Amino acid sequence: KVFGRCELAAAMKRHGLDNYRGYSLGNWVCAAKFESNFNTQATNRNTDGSTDYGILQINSRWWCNDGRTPGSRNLCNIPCSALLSSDITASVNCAKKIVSDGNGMNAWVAWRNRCKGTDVQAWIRGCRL
Numbered sequence: 001k002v003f004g005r006c007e008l009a010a011a012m013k014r015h016g017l018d019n020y021r022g023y024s025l026g027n028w029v030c031a032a033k034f035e036s037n038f039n040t041q042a043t044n045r046n047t048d049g050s051t052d053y054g055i056l057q058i059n060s061r062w063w064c065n066d067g068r069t070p071g072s073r074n075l076c077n078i079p080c081s082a083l084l085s086s087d088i089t090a091s092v093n094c095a096k097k098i099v100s101d102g103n104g105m106n107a108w109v110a111w112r113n114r115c116k117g118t119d120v121q122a123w124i125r126g127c128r129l
């Protein structure tokens with residue numbers, strides 16, 4: 001599913017991401033925009049052989065099992081394919097673990113490089129939450 005901006009903001013709010021670990025909703029919407037272009041089906045291979053999955057581009061080396069990443073730790077205890085669903089629940093639940101891991105949203109390179117320090121409130125402007 002390709003989400004609209006406000007549609008995704010509303011879904012993320014319903015799933016408890018607004019101000020989760022102190023990160024306002026706009027941060028999450030911005031991260032999703034630049035990680036996946038709001039497409040739940042996005043996948044991208046990495047040089048290390050791992051793959052990133054779904055709207056928040058969660059990695060198979062640490063977080064989910066894709067059956068082809070040797071030594072994967074599967075810390076979210078889910079198949080990576082679950083992260084490609086139109087229902088964002090599994091992605092959100094896993095993202096909450098990632099952001100709690102010590103480095104906050106710096107875990108997402110696109111967030112660090114494209115969202116951090118910017119006016120992230122713009123990403124939810126106009127939306128009826």
Ligand SMILES: [Cl-]
Nearest residue numbers: 021103104105
């Ligand atoms: Cl933090």
Ligand SMILES: [Co+2]
Nearest residue numbers: 052057059109
């Ligand atoms: Co990535």
